[PDB]
Amino acid sequence: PRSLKKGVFVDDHLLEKVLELNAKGEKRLIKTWSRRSTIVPEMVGHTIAVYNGKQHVPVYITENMVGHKLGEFAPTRTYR
Template identity: 35%
Template sequence: MSSEYRTGREGEFTYRGHTLDELQEMSLDEVAELLPARQRRTIQRGLSVQQEKLRERAREAGEQETANDPIRTHLRDMPVLPEFVDLTFEVYTGQSFERVRVEPEMIGHYLGEFQLTRTSVEHGQAGIGATRSSKFVPLK
């Protein structure tokens, strides 16, 4: 894993006073103590079978630094852990899989936060069968 991320006062990425390398060497329970309450509770109650499988696949992908194949998942509720940094996931949005490259700043969030499931609505002109009043478009 590369530690070329520069943020913070000293120029090195830190999460609650710990560098990325320190976070990656911590156990899951030690990392859980640093996470926000909702993510900490998820880990303390125990990750689901699917979440453990995803974590194992991420660990294997992290060891193979040559392969950049994205990890496909439906688990939008998986907390981003320090071992996921620099990996690429394909998160399911309900219609398709969208790529998410995990950065250190994403630690403590959920994978689903980085791919929206709803698109923003952009209204155009009134369609066929619209009423007369809804067809009115003011001239500029």
């Protein structure tokens, strides 16, 4: 767990922030933007704002679901 990918790739755009900041711990949601990522390792258990198109909902990630193409962790429509 979570590696799999290594290092916890995040398309730099989200990787740079993920790293080092992972130092003083968290503070949560860092309103992510290029979810083109393939979330990974350390990304296990944190909060970031997933641009659902017009909003920055706050997402919290967990173990076995961390590393996967960022996008699909924040919905983007609204039917029924």
